[PDB]
Design a protein around this ligand. Structure first.
Ligand code: OVA
Ligand code: CO
Ligand code: CO
Ligand code: CO
Ligand code: K
Length: 304
């Protein structure tokens, strides 16, 4: 394999971390290939669930806990910490909240979170590499509690970063929030990418096309698919009671991606940097509830 930038994987990985059996597990956690037969049974649909009041309380809970776990990871970002050390803290933080770390064994993903440094677009595997001053790193968290998943991510600065990194991360966050500010009953899901791309392109950046926001509730991913680029063909109209993510991946150079031989790590083909932010949203009767928001502080960690 010809690497696209300076990053390399730092092996070996630790053996997979067990989750105590008192923690409730999603179907795929015990499947030998990590397949989710509840996702498979619904493979085949654009129909979107309307959540019950019961489901809304379960989503509110797991999303608040997921935010608490992202905040634990945020407090670890400093030069010299390895991404495996971040993952270990996340794993234990999930278990302390009586939650399963949804990534773990999902289609045999080997870790409890994704850590995406520099040219990694998404799904980076925590490994032995120490963070370096000047890096940007995304940590993506998903928890499972009482049959519900909750999903969020933020990009962080590692010590001092250059102006390009600041502009990329700020723009990506602004893309997410402009999209969120448009969510309300009656808006087509395909509109959000028109908003995102407009702001990215105005700032000289590109939008990843191979990954999208997703419905999330009893399944980790389900309908709707929410592309982040303009003039997409997404199906559906937002209604109160829909729950889904918005998770734009914005790149310094071109938008084209490729995957490492590990089968997960998505990188820019040109080796330039990418950033991402994500929230889980509930559509309400007149707008949206940001389930994964910070309750205690005004701004994302990179601005705090
Ligand atoms: C990791 C991911 O959430 C990125 C955005 C997607 O496109 C979404 O798929 C709809 C994902 O690719 C997801 C949910 O398929 C992967 C599974 C997740 C994990 C964390 C290893
Ligand atoms: Co799946
Ligand atoms: Co997601
Ligand atoms: Co995520
Ligand atoms: K990145």
């Amino acid at each position: 394999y010809r690497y696209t930038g300076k990053l390399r994987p730092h092996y070996p990985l630790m053996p997979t971390r067990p989750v105590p059996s008192y923690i409730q597990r999603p179907d795929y956690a015990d499947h030998p290939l990590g397949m989710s037969e509840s996702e498979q049974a619904l493979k085949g649909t654009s129909q979107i669930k309307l959540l019950s009041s019961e489901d809304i309380e379960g989503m509110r809970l797991v999303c608040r806990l997921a935010r608490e776990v992202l905040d634990v990871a945020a407090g670890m970002i400093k030069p010299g910490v390895t991404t495996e050390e971040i993952d270990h803290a996340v794993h234990l933080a999930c278990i302390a909240r009586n939650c399963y770390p949804s990534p773990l064994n999902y289609y045999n993903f080997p870790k409890s979170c994704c850590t995406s440094v520099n040219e990694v677009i998404c799904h980076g595997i925590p490994d032995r590499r120490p963070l370096q001053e000047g890096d940007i790193v995304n940590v993506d968290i998903t928890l499972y509690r009482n049959g519900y998943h909750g999903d969020l991510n933020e990009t962080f600065f590692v010590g001092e970063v250059d102006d390009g990194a600041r502009k990329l991360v700020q723009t990506t966050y602004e893309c997410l929030m402009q999209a969120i500010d448009a969510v309300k009953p009656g808006v087509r899901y395909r509109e959000l990418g028109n908003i995102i791309q407009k702001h990215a392109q105005a700032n000289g950046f590109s939008v990843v096309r191979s990954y999208c926001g997703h419905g999330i509730h009893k399944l980790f991913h389900t309908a709707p698919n929410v592309p982040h680029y303009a003039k997409n063909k997404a199906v559906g109209v937002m209604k109160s009671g829909h729950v889904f993510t918005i998770e734009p991946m914005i790149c310094e150079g071109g938008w084209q991606d490729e995957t490492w031989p590990d089968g997960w790590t998505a990188v820019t083909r040109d080796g330039k940097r990418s950033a991402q932010f994500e929230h889980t949203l509930l559509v309400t009767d007149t707008g949206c509830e940001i389930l994964t928001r910070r309750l205690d502080s005004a701004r994302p960690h990179f601005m705090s």
